[PDB]
Nucleic acid binder design. Structure first.
Lengths: 147, 49, 201, 49
RNA sequence: GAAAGCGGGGCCUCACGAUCCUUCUGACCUUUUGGGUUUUAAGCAGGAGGUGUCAGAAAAGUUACCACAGGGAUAACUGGCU
RNA sequence: GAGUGGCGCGGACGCUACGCCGCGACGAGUAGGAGGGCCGCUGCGGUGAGCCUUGAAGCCUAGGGCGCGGGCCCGGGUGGAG
RNA sequence: CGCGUCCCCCGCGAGCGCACGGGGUCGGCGGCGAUGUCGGCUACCCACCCGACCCGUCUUGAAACACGGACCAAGGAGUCUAACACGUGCGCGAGUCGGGGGCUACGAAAGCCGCCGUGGCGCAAUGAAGGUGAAGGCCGGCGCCGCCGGCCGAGGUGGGAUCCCGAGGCCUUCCAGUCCGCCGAGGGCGCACCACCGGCCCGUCUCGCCCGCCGCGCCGGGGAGGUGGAGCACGAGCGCACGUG
RNA sequence: CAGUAACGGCGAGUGAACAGGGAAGAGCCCAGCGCCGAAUCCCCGCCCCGCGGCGGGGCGCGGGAAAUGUGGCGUACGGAAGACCCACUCCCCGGCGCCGGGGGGCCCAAGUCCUUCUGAUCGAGGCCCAGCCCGUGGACGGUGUGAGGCCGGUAGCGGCCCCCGGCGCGCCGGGCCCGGGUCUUCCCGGAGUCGGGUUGCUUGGGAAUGCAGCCCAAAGCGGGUGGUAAACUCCAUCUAAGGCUAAAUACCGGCACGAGACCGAUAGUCAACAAGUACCGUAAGGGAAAGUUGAAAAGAACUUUGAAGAGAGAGUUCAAGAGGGCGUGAAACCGUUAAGAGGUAAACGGGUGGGGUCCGCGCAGUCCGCCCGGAGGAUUCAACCCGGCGGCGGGUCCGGCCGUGCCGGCGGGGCGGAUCUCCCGCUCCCGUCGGCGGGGGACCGCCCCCCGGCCGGCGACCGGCCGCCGCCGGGCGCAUUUCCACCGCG
């Protein structure tokens, strides 16, 4: 939309909204991220701290799949199953705990951010946190591991 | 889903539920009054003092 | 020159990029020509499946993906061997063949052997001279009821097991899964010099 | 919504238009220099036309 | 120092220096990429090697053969104030 | 405010609510910023049962007017298809 | 300027009219009228009084003995693409999005897929790293246990738009009085948000004491007190479109 | 994936790959090792069919190539020979007869109907109570404006004649006479090349990713790779230094088409025209300007002045106020006609006055209610019958339909659910508990529908009989009523 723009209301106005004392000249402070350590030092030090210099070890050939570990919390754990399972698990009197395979849902590790509703459950995860495990012992459950 | 179900505010604003819980209209217009100098104008001075 | 707080950008446009802009006005004519060539082929190989041959079941490598299943390239020779199909007959009756595939496991094998037994049962085979049949061919009942197949032949879907709600054992609740992880990590790390010091001992 | 969705959907059935990439620059012109009382633009390189 | 206390440099106001690279020091430290042992290398933390144009380019002249962009923001004339 | 006891067939305008109305104070302005344009140009989707050889665009004008202005609308002439 | 009644001393008359009264009216008049006069501001020409230096631009300062401009017509200068940030409109919402692919004149459009969400961005951070990875008191048994258990359980303070209760009260010649509607003394629940104090997660330091076992070891886990983080503390994101930088 | 791992005066900047989802999908052959009497190939001369891709057959003590290795078998997925089981008759290239992709040419609906405007119609109005006619055709172009119907075309899984392809039955020519499963017995491979040292370039590739020069130069339970230099050691993964190979991809050149929210002759290609032209440069090279009379030339016979260019009359045309570089005809600037003015260069803002130009189509001057005052006219009100239509409420009638409503039924199904469990598959122990995967059947959820009852509605969604009011039409009424037009200086 060229009608709604600012240009259309600078027609008549001399400088086209770029000043009279200092003009609209081409590149009056260099191009791109230039002058970083010299005449744009304050902008870089103030809004982009730690930009210049080296930190840590170089890992030449890095494959992102070996370090693949998507997390779920106990908050959203009962949502990988139906509401049917949770309801019928309390409705059953035998003490049978429904089995939540976490890797079927597409999470490897279980973290322990969440409050858990009070019924027994088994969790077939690839990894477990300490507080994550303790909370499922606290509710009265199991932590089966997956290879 | 609709953002308001019943879009007939003709019916709504005169319906007894709403009209019950209103305050009376202030429908009388008060234009400016010309200031008459009551030191010259006797009756206006009597209207004040 | 930077104004205020804002992201520090590095646009890759320092070369003669305007000469090598590739614009996609081809796209709806490219889709039409592909759909044309597709239907042309599907009519050419007339009663044979439109997708072409049957691809085998294959696990994705790399831990990120190995919980999935794809279509593989072609059936290993030691899957054809134990299924009882010749590697030079297989390709002529519509079975993809890969001469590079190894078989580390026997379940990866046995799934693909039962894949070929189902395929060789489903397959209708026409006479090479249509008036005089041969032994390994189909019955004229099935030959008149034979039809062009749409989409990938015996398609590969990804099904998981059903685990019924069980009562949690007194040991199963007792097992320390976090401590097991942590002490499996240290047994993997320190093992090498635990063998060294025990050798020097 | 229909005004927005009609405005944006109608731009999809639209053949592109441009000028020639080479148009304008197909000469060998150069600036004359600041002397010789002309206006310092490029001028078509000399001849008898 | 008997003790109250006083002392983490000079009675006080000055005496000094970033990224990169190097060099040393520290832990029974992490990593060296398919697994182990060992040299090596890379890391993490703290000092030093120095930028005196001292918030820190690596740097000699000449042009009367000279050239371009500008400047009355700036000299060689008049004119003005003194 | 509300309950139980002690003849004549009449009544202006209004309220495009994105509208209409009432009262009070205020109004310099370069660079610059924002808003409102029933200011103007050229093309596309809708729409005006639009205009037009009984004369479209364009152009000229001591003609008649509107708008704070951008501009615009009628009269007369020329012109010949939008 | 009525008495029928409330003290210390000596509740509705009726009219008519004039107006220094919430902004001007006349129920007053008089001329002149068809090719010679009436109106017509603006607009053509002229005269007179007052005012009045030539625009643009850089400049502390331009009418300048500063530069550009003889005159006229047509052309003629913040655009498009990618990136980012913030505001704004729309759709869905712990999600969101087919953009690449496939299916069945206008139309190279529109429609559809979900076992086409691969994937992108989001829902978890911190460490160079290996790695680790987001709330608890009490009540018994084992003035104490590493725990066996049992009940309940996402903080506190101050300010906070609204909401809630209601000491009393809102009339017609009274007295009780019943129902709705309404005002309000004072007293409570407290949204978002702000300030403060707690707490939890990761890194790292100081001090110390207990627990575990298919693998008793330079094995693994735990506690208290500061401290570094682009964190948690019952989600706000994604896609599209527009605006300014 | 990803502006990521990485490179970078670690500054400015630069910057891939694997995995994953698709588009497409296709695989093979030598040398070597070996066995088959060189079993192989090229060419001349004669004959026959018969080949605008020079090919098949017969014939020759015709000639050559080749053991310094041609062909058959055969290649890392193993191969070959010998023994025992097992079972086949059909692959391939070239003539034909017939039906069932493209290039060419010729064609196929309906108004020039009746009045009317114009120079000319394609405009305007009309065309049965059979909405002019056709419409699988209402794209576009031409035609004296603007045309579905005048013409070419357009539509059509429309017609006809030619020509060149593609495939299958089978007649018919030629060749080839060929399989697999298991043991025993042999065999197995590319060297100035890998590799290392150094040098230069290159890379995202960092103690060196790729390529190259020179020097050194291998091995065979080897060699290569395993993103940090090196030694020892397990493990994984390929088989380098020989070769061929479709499809999916790219395309401002070329031949042909179709289109556009693009430009509309100072624009758009430099080029709408005798444009890469004229012209310029010794040359390499540089490189313009330039569209439009009119529907139709009907392009001005003839008279007349002049040496002629040029005029003046006639004449054609709707028009020369369109006259051959001629549609429209702006401004600058110039000529002339009219008006006014004029010694402070002109021009300018404010305020008037004077004169023009046209305009009000000026010049006896506003209409509007009701009433009163006179006078005319009309078949005329109020009421009451008969009909049709509408409104509301019928507070709460009778019957219907709906529900981002709800409660029932032993009412009859669709999807769904990470809710549960009877038949069949393969195999394991020997018809055979139990294992295995895929179908069925119970249960929960939402939904669709049939019967039942409330609650809401019918104002985003209704009828019929009542009742009242209102309207319209026709009777009836017929004048102190009602209603029209005209005067009164009301």
């Amino acid at each position: 939309p060229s009608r709604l723009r600012k240009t259309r209301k600078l027609r008549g106005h001399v400088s086209h909204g770029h000043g009279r004392i200092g003009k609209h000249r081409k590149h009056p402070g260099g191009r791109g991220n230039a002058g970083g350590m010299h005449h744009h030092r304050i902008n870089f030090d103030k809004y982009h701290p730690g930009y210049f210099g080296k930190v840590g070890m170089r890992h030449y050939h890095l494959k992102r799949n070996q370090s693949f570990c998507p997390t779920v919390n106990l908050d959203k754990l009962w949502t990988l199953v139906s509401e049917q399972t949770r309801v019928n698990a309390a409705k059953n009197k035998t003490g049978a705990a429904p089995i939540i395979d976490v890797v079927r849902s597409g999470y490897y590790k279980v973290l322990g951010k969440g409050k858990l509703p009070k019924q027994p459950v088994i969790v077939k995860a690839k990894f477990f946190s300490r507080r994550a495990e303790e909370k499922i012992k606290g509710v009265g459950g199991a932590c089966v591991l997956v290879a | 889903m609709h953002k308001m179900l019943n879009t007939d505010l003709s019916r709504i604003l005169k319906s007894p539920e709403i009209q019950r819980a209103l305050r009376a209209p202030r429908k009388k217009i008060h234009r400016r009054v010309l200031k008459k100098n009551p030191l010259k104008n006797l009756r206006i001075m009597l209207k004040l003092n | 020159a930077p104004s205020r707080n804002g992201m520090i950008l590095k646009p890759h446009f320092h070369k003669d990029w305007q000469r090598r802009v590739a614009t996609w006005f081809n796209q709806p004519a490219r889709k039409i020509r592909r759909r044309k060539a597709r239907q042309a082929r599907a009519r050419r190989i007339a009663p044979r499946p439109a997708a072409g041959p049957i691809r085998p079941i294959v696990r994705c490598p790399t831990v990120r993906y190995h919980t999935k299943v794809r279509a593989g390239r072609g059936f290993s020779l030691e899957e054809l061997r134990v299924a009882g199909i010749h590697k030079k007959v297989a390709r002529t009756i519509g079975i993809s063949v890969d001469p590079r595939r190894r078989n580390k496991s026997t379940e990866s094998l046995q799934a693909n052997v039962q894949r070929l037994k189902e395929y060789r049962s489903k397959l209708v085979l026409f006479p090479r001279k249509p008036s005089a049949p041969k032994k390994g061919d189909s019955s004229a009942e099935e030959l008149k009821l034979a039809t062009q197949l749409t989409g990938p032949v015996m398609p590969i879907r990804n099904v998981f097991k059903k685990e019924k709600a069980r009562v949690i054992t007194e040991e199963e609740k007792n097992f320390k899964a976090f401590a097991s992880l942590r002490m499996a990590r240290a047994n993997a790390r320190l093992f090498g010099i635990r063998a060294k010091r025990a050798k020097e001992a | 919504i229909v005004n927005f969705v009609h405005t944006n959907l109608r731009k999809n059935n639209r053949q592109p238009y441009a000028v020639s990439e080479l148009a304008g620059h197909q000469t060998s012109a150069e600036s004359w220099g600041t002397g010789r009382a002309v206006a310092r633009i490029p001028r078509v390189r000399g001849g008898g036309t």
